[PDB]
């Protein structure tokens, strides 16, 4: 059981051997936010600590792999507090359900802010593989404007990616629809 330090709504991993066991065994990545001791004047390659998304932290917590601790005692993520204000929101639950559903299938996942989406879906390790999809999380009853779908389709065509639409049904199962440009 590896240790994760959660405090003020951020999850950081400091050990260099717990990061290795996360990537190979559970297929969860992350973004490094520190500065390299060797080259601390650049912005290309960074070092420890490693930043975990809230969905990743919850997934590690539930399935019994790591123990969440407060800033120096075990922490409970099922009650809203100052160290965990993520409990009791619709968007966070939506994103967590979609993340878990896609993770169970065997995909790698990452952030897609620059590409106008929610997640990036990989066929394998982000090293040695191009991303295939740009996933968007939509509530089942929301209305999607048509002017904001053409831009997504054009960006996907220009970057060679496909757009995914995700909307979890109240039965605990998620349905996916694929959109792409067709030339005729």
């Amino acid at each position: 059981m590896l240790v994760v330090e959660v405090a003020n709504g951020r999850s950081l991993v400091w050990g260099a051997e717990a990061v290795q066991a996360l990537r190979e065994r559970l297929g969860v990545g992350g973004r490094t936010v520190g500065a390299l001791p060797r080259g601390p004047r650049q912005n290309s390659r960074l070092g420890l600590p490693l930043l975990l998304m809230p969905e990743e932290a919850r997934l590690l917590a539930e399935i019994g792999a790591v123990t969440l601790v407060s800033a120096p005692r075990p922490l409970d993520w099922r009650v809203q507090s100052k160290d965990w204000p993520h409990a009791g929101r619709p968007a966070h639950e939506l994103r967590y359900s979609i993340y878990r559903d896609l993770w169970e299938r065997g995909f790698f996942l990452s952030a897609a802010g620059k590409f106008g989406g929610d997640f990036l879906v990989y066929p394998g390790d982000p090293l040695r593989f191009f991303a295939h999809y740009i996933a968007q999380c939509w509530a089942p009853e929301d209305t999607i404007p048509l002017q904001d779908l053409v831009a997504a389709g054009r960006l996907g065509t220009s970057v060679r990616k496909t757009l995914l639409l995700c909307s979890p049904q109240p039965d605990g199962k998620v349905v996916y629809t694929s959109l792409q440009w067709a030339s005729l």
Partner: protein, 220 residues
């Protein structure tokens, strides 16, 4: 040495094969990544500056004369040399100081949980500050006499910078999260008025990714 390796050695792939040739490049790329996170810094004791953290007052005060970084960072009061918590954290992570606390040495950890707090600077602001500082910019604090937080000078002004009379900054920034609503017209107008005659830049942080957008008025 001084050269650093490349993340993926060459162009990436499109579809997995599982043909034992795609499973060797992956191993070679993976084993060269954790050889880099395990490295730790070391410095001679003859070029370290000591300092002490004072949470009661809210500064970091030096006990030795400062070095080359004094031309752009720090502030002097009552004859002593003092630093802001974010400047102190950047200097510690860069390795220019040897911060203590009640005669007890500190680490890079157990100091992210003393200086990074809602009372002092936050996490996103420190991220943007260090991102700009590693590129050679001069980053300062915005004194009025979402809110404007920093003053940024270009990298050409470092050589002859003067702390007492710096002049007109290149721009000034307001740090924001990525999943938060876009400000309306009134907020942007008030921010433009408060900034003055200099450009305003919006910094968005998305789980460790920073992008900047500039909002200009009066196209024609």
């Amino acid at each position: 040495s001084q050269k650093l390796p490349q993340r993926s050695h060459g162009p990436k792939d499109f579809l997995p094969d599982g043909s034992a040739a795609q499973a060797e490049r992956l191993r070679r790329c993976r084993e060269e990544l954790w050889q880099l996170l395990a490295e730790q810094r070391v410095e001679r004791l003859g070029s370290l500056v000591a300092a002490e953290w004072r949470p009661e007052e809210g500064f970091v005060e030096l006990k030795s004369p400062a070095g080359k970084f004094w031309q752009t960072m720090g502030f002097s009061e009552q004859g002593r040399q003092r630093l802001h918590p974010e400047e102190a954290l950047y200097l510690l992570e860069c390795g220019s100081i040897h911060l203590f606390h009640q005669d007890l040495p500190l680490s890079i950890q157990e100091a992210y949980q003393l200086l990074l707090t809602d009372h002092t600077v936050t996490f996103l602001q420190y991220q943007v500050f260090s991102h700009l500082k590693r590129l050679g910019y001069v980053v300062r604090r915005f004194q009025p006499s979402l809110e404007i937080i920093f003053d940024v000078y270009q990298a050409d002004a470092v050589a002859t910078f003067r702390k007492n009379n710096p002049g007109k900054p290149y721009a000034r920034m307001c740090i924001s999260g990525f999943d938060e609503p876009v400000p309306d017209l009134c907020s942007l107008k008030r921010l433009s008025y408060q900034s003055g005659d200099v450009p305003l830049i919006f910094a968005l942080v998305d789980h460790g990714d920073i992008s900047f957008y500039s909002f200009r008025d009066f196209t024609l």
